[PDB]
Design an enzyme around this catalytic site. Structure first.
Site, short mmCIF file in Angstrom:
data_model
loop_
_atom_site.label_atom_id
_atom_site.label_comp_id
_atom_site.label_asym_id
_atom_site.label_seq_id
_atom_site.Cartn_x
_atom_site.Cartn_y
_atom_site.Cartn_z
N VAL A 1 -0.10 -2.49 -4.82
CA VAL A 1 0.30 -3.68 -5.56
C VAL A 1 -0.15 -4.91 -4.78
CG1 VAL A 1 2.23 -5.01 -6.45
CG2 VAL A 1 2.24 -2.52 -6.66
N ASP B 1 13.72 3.22 -5.77
CA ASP B 1 12.32 2.81 -5.85
C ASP B 1 11.51 3.99 -6.37
OD1 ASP B 1 9.89 1.14 -5.23
OD2 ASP B 1 9.58 2.74 -3.77
N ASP C 1 8.32 0.05 3.39
CA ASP C 1 8.70 -0.25 2.01
C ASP C 1 10.21 -0.20 1.83
OD1 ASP C 1 7.92 2.41 2.70
OD2 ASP C 1 8.34 3.02 0.64
N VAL D 1 0.87 -1.17 0.00
CA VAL D 1 0.00 0.00 0.00
C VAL D 1 0.90 1.23 0.00
CG1 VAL D 1 -1.75 1.30 1.21
CG2 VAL D 1 -1.90 -1.18 1.11
N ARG D 2 1.05 1.84 -1.17
CA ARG D 2 1.76 3.11 -1.27
C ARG D 2 0.75 4.25 -1.22
NH1 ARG D 2 5.69 -0.11 -3.61
NH2 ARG D 2 7.66 0.23 -2.49
N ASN D 3 1.25 5.48 -1.33
CA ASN D 3 0.39 6.65 -1.21
C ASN D 3 -0.65 6.70 -2.32
OD1 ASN D 3 3.40 7.27 -0.44
ND2 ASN D 3 2.16 8.50 0.96
N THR D 4 -0.25 6.37 -3.54
CA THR D 4 -1.12 6.49 -4.71
C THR D 4 -1.62 5.15 -5.24
OG1 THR D 4 0.23 8.41 -5.30
CG2 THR D 4 -1.36 7.64 -6.93
#
EC number: 2.7.1.33
Lengths: 261, 261, 261, 261, 261, 261
Positions: free
Chosen positions: E13, E131, E111, E7-10
Site C-alpha cells: 500500500v 487486520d 505492521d 510492504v506486506r507479504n502479498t
C-alpha cells in the site's frame, strides 16, 4: 541391536548398531528420502522393509530430527509399532554433557550436538566437525568438550540443484569429479564448480576457524573430522580435513541413548 | 550513447555508455529483475522509464541474454522500438575474436564470452574472470586470448535461499559479514557460512586453476578480475582476486558492438 | 532372468526378460514413479518388492536413466545390491553398434539410442521410432543403422497438465478419446485437442520426415514403430504408424547387455 | 479511440482502434504478460504507459478476460481511471448475434465467442478459426454464423516450456524454425518437434473437422483463418490454413462494443 | 506530503497523507503487488508513476515492511531518488510509545505495532484490532495503551488460493459473498466457506479474547476496529466488529514519522 | 474383510472392516500420503505391505477418490492384483439412497456423499457433519436423509502450511493447542490462530446453518458429528459439535458396498 534414526532436510539415515559402550559398532546403515508429510505407517513400512528380521531383536531406538513433524511421526510410529523398546527422541538444545556456549542453547539443531558429542568422545581434544548434509554444518568443540558454535553453509547437492534449476543453460548433472578444474563442456564446468569450489569452501572455513579463534591454531592439536554422504567425493580435494567418519552421528545417537538410559 | 543490456537468470542490468573506444565509460546503470515471461512492449516501457529522454540520443544498442525467451523478446524489441540505430544481439558462439577452445562452442553462455573479451581487452594477458551472479562463473583466458573453459559453481544468494527454503528451521537472512567465523546464533552461523565459505570457494577455485593448468602458476602474470553485484560482499575476504570491475560485461558488450559495427 | 530398468523423467519401467538372442522375451513388467531424489536403498527396496522371489534368479542387470541423480543412485544400487551378476549401465555416447551422426553424440539421451538399436535389430532397414513419454521422441534410423537425429515434441499428458495449470477454467482431466472432434463442452474440447491434435502432430512429423530426407520416401521400405505407455491411446488415430512395440526399450537394453557381455 | 483489452492466461493484448463500423481498423497494439494477482493501480499504470497521450482521446473501452480476477480489476481500473467512457465487460456466454449451439453456452470463454463473431462478420460463411494463445483454440462456425464448437489443444510455447522443465536433458529453447525436420542437436530437435509437430497438430485438427462435420467438406467453400502471436511462425508449415488475421479478436471486441452501444 | 509505504507479504500500500496531527488525512492511496526480489530502480519507477507530479512536493517518507529485503531496497531507493526528504524506516520492534508486553519485543512485525499505535491514538481506551492482510492479525491493546499480543490466523484470499491450488476439483474462484451459507454448488460452497467461516473465525477470536483476558469483558468499553483490503467483504457478516478504519496503518505510520522527527 | 480406500488430496486412508450390517466395525486403519502420479504397481505394493496377511482374506474393496487419476489407478490395481474380489469404485455424484438436491448433483465429491450417508444411517435425522481434511467440509442433511449442501472452507493444517510457506518471517510450526488465546510470541500467536480461529470457523458455520435453514434451530434436534484426523485437536474448543466418529467415511464406504451388492 539399537535402531538409530537421523532425519535431515533431504535424506534420512537409518542405522542398526550392535554392542554397547566402547565395543559397540554400526552393523547396518541405509539412506532414504526425507518426506515432510510422511506418516507413521509409511515410515514404519519403509523402516521394516529396510531392517528385515531385526525388528524383533531391537533393544532400543534412538532418534533425532531437523524436521519436527517427522520427529512427532517418529514418536507415533515407535509407540504404535515398537511399544516394548525404550526410545529417547532428541530435540534441538538437548543436554548431553557438552556445554552449549552459544546465545540460544535451545535453538541449535540436534545433529550438531550429536556430532560434537561423538567427536569429543572419539578424540578427547579440540575438534572441528564438518557434516556434509542438506547443509554443510561446521561445529567447533573446545578442548573441554564445549560447543562453541561454528558455521552453516549450503550443501553441495542442494546448491548444485538450485543452480541448475535457477538457470536455463545449466541442467541437472551428476555429482562427480571432472577430469580437470578447467571444464570443456557445461557438465564438466558444473562438476568442477560443485566439487572443487565446495572443497575450497570447506578448506577456507576450517582454516579461518583455525586462525581466528584461540586454542585451535596450527600449533595446537585439533582433530578435523568429516562426515556425510558426499564427504568421500570431496575428501581427496581437502587439504584441511584429516579423518573421515561415516558413522559419527549414529555413534553420537548411541552415546545419547546410553546416557539417557 | 550506447544502450547495453545484460539479461541474466535473476537480474537484468541496463547501461548507458558514452564515448568511443578507450575514451568510453559507463555513465548510467540500473538493475531490475529478469522476468522470463516479459515481452518486448513491457521491456521497452521499463527501459524507456529508466533511461528518460536519452532515447533520442542513442547511437546504438547491444544485448545478451542467458534466458532464451527474453532473448526472443529482446530481438523483437530491438527490431520494433529503435529502428534507426544499429543493434547487435549476442547468441552463444558469436563473433568476438576470442577463440572458443571448448567441446561445444555453441553452448557457452554469452555472458562468459563477453566477460572474457572485456578482460583480455583490458589486460592483454592470461586472465581469470570470476562473475558473481545466479551462478559463480569462473572463466580462464589464455595468454593468447583463448577461452579455455573454467567452472560454474552455485551462487551465494541462490544457494543461501535454497538452504533457507529446504529447511523449516532456517528463515530468510540478509547476506552480510558476521562478527566472527564461529557464530553464536543460527543467523550468525548461516551468515558465516554464506560469506566465508563462498569466499573460500572462490579462493579454492582460483588456486586450483593456478596450480593445475599450465601458464597460470605464480610465476606467470595472471590478471584475476571479479565482477557482479554480490562481488563486493565477498571481496574483502578474498585472497586470490586482484581487481574488481563492476562494468566488465557492459564494456565487453561495447567491444562486441564496435567490432561488429 | 535379466533385470532391465528404464528410468524416464516421469515414470520408471522395471522388466524381467528371460531367454537369449531371438528366444528372449519380456516375462514381467512394472511401472512406478520416477523420484528425482530417490536413493539406492529405496529403489532396491521397491525393486525387491516388485520382483519378489526372482531376486536370486537374476543373471544380469541393464539400466538407463534420463535423470542424472537417479543414474547416480542406480549406479550405487547396482554395485551394492547385486554384486554377483554383471551389470551394464548406459550413459550417453554408449558403444552399441549404432553410429551417432549428430553434432553432440554425448548429449543424445540413452532412451533414444536404445530405441534405435532395438528398432534396427528388429527391422534391419530404415526406421522411424516414436516414443510417447514425458516428451514425444522421434528417432530416424538410416538403412545402414545410423542414428540421423529426429525431433523432440512436447508430450500429451505433460502438455495437458501444463495447460490445465496455466488456466483457471481448466482442471485436471483424465485423458480419453472424445465422442467427436468438435466438442460441445470444455472437457470434450480439451480431450479432442489432446487426442486428435497430438495424433496429427505425430502424423505430420512422420510425413515431413518421409518427405524431406533422402531414403525415407514412400518408395523406400521404412518401418514406422511406436512405443510408450500413452501410445495405445493415440494409436487408432494415427495413419502413419505401422507397428506398435511396447517393450522396445527393454529389448534394446537386452541387446546392449548381450553386446557388452 | 476504442481501447480493447484481451486478458489471456499468459499474455494480455491492449489495442487502440480508430474509426467506426466498416471504416474502423486497429491502429495500435501491444502485448504484455498476464499477472494473475495484478491490481487496478498497476494495470492502470502499465496501460497508461503503453497508450501514452491517447488516454484523453478514448471514446469507450471494450474488455474481455479468461481470468475473471483480472476482469474485475479491469472494471475497477476503468471506473476509477476512465469514468467518462462507457465500458462493456464480456463474460462467457456473451450475447453477440452468434448463437451458441453447445451444451454449456455460459462456459465457453469470451475469446472464442469474440473470434467467432469477428470471423463470421468478415467472411459471412462457414469458417474455421485457429487461435494460437496460451492454448490453441479451434472454432467452427457454420454458414448461419453459429458456434458449433471446436477443440482446445495445448499451446506451442506453453507445451515447449513444460517439456523443457519436466525433463532434465531438455533446456528452454528459443521458439524458432530449425534447418530441417531431422534435428542434429537437442536445441534443433526441440525446435523441430515444437514447430513441425504443432503445425501437424493444427493441420490434423482442421482436416479432421473438415472431414467429420456436415457441410465443411473440401467441395464447400470454408474460410480458414489463423490468429495469434506465434501464428506467423507456423503459417508457412500449414497446408489447411489460408488466411492470417492478427487483429481478429480486437475487431470482435469492437463489434461487441458497437452492438452494446 | 508524507509518503507512507506498507510492504506486506502479498500486497504493498502506497499512500500520500497531507496535513499534520489532527488536521492530517490520507489524500491518496494505491495498492500494488509485492515482489520480494524487486530492486530499487523498479520500485522507484512504479512509485514515481503512482505519485505523478507529487514527487517534488514530498516533505518526508515513512515505511514499514514485513519483507526485510523490500525495506532495504526501499532505503536504497529513497536515498538514491529522494535525497532531500527525511525518511524513518521502521523495523520490527519499533519504539513508538506503545509498550510491547510480549516475550520477544524484537520479533513482532512493524505492521501490528503501527496498528496498535493508531488504534490507541483514535480510541484512547482498550482496543482489539483485526487486520485482514496476507494473514489475519488480531492485536490486543490494553486500557493503558500496551501491546499485550494477539493471534495470527491464515488469511482469507491466501487460504482460498491455497485450497484451489491443493485440489484439482477446486479452481481459482473469485472472492465474493454467496447467495446463502448453504452452497448449492462447488463455487458457492467455496465462497460460503471463505466468507462465513472466516467471519466466524474473527468473531471467535474476538469473543475468546473478550472473555479470557483481564479488563476486556463485555462490561468494559472496548473498541473493536477492523482494517484491510478484504475487511469490507466480511464486515457485514461480523457481530463483534464495530468500526472499520481503512487507513489505520497509514495513520500509524504518520504518527511514528511525527514522533521520530 | 472389506478393504476401504479413501483417497483425499493430501492423505489416503486404508481400512479393514470385519462383520456385516450392524455387527460390522473397523478393525484396521492406516494413513499414508497421497501421490498424484502414483501407479497401480506402487499402490499395490504399499497396500499389500500395509495390510499384511489379510490380503488373502479380502471379500471386497470399496474405494473413493477425490483425485480421479488415483481412482483409475486403483481400478487397474484391483483388477490386476485382487481379481477375485468385487470392487465398487465411487465417482462424484454417486447414488447411495441419499438424494442430491444441488445444482450439479454429479460434481459433489464422493467423500461428502459417503459422510452424509454414514451420518444419516447412524442418526436417522437431520445432521451437521464436519469433516476435517485437506479442506474442512461441512455437510447438512435434512430429516428425510437428503443432501442439502454445505460449505468447503480451507483446512487447518493445509492453511497453516500455506501461511508458513508464503510468508518469509513465518516458519513451519507444529499444529497444537497453545496455552492462551493471546499469544506472547510469534509461534504462540500462530498456534492460537490456527486452533481457536478454526474452531470459531466451524462454530460460526454450524451456527449460521442452524439459524438460517428450516428445521435446524435449537428447538429442533440435529445431531452434530465430527470426523477427520485433526478433528480431536479442535474438538475441545468446539461448542456446537456434539459427537465424534473417526471412522465415518469407512462405514459409509461399507454402506455403499453393501448397497451395490
Amino acid at each position: 541391536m539399537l535402531l538409530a534414526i537421523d532425519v535431515r532436510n533431504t535424506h534420512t539415515v537409518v542405522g542398526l548398531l550392535s554392542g554397547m559402550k566402547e565395543h559397540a559398532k554400526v552393523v547396518q546403515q541405509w539412506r532414504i528420502r526425507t518426506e515432510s508429510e510422511v506418516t507413521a505407517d509409511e515410515l514404519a513400512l519403509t523402516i521394516d522393509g529396510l531392517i528385515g528380521e531385526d525388528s524383533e531383536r531391537l533393544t532400543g531406538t534412538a532418534a533425532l530430527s531437523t524436521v519436527p513433524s517427522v520427529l512427532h511421526e517418529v514418536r507415533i510410529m515407535l509407540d504404535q509399532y515398537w511399544p516394548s523398546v525404550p526410545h529417547v527422541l532428541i530435540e534441538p538444545g538437548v543436554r548431553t554433557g557438552i556445554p552449549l556456549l552459544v546465545d540460544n542453547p535451545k535453538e541449535v539443531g540436534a545433529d550438531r550436538i550429536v556430532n560434537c558429542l561423538a567427536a569429543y568422545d572419539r578424540f578427547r581434544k579440540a575438534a572441528i566437525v564438518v557434516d556434509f548434509g542438506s547443509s554443510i554444518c561446521v561445529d567447533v568443540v573446545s578442548a573441554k568438550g564445549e560447543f562453541l558454535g561454528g558455521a552453516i553453509a549450503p550443501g553441495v547437492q542442494v546448491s548444485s540443484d538450485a543452480a541448475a534449476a535457477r538457470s536455463a543453460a545449466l541442467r541437472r548433472v551428476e555429482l562427480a569429479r571432472p577430469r580437470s578444474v578447467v571444464g570443456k563442456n557445461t557438465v564438466e564446468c558444473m562438476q568442477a564448480g560443485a566439487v572443487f569450489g565446495f572443497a575450497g569452501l570447506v578448506d577456507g572455513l576450517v582454516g579461518r576457524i583455525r586462525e581466528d579463534v584461540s586454542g585451535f591454531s596450527v600449533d595446537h592439536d585439533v582433530a578435523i573430522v568429516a562426515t556425510g554422504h558426499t564427504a568421500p567425493l570431496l575428501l581427496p580435494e581437502l587439504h584441511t580435513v584429516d579423518h573421515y567418519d561415516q558413522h559419527l552421528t549414529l555413534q553420537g545417537l548411541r552415546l545419547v541413548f546410553e546416557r539417557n538410559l
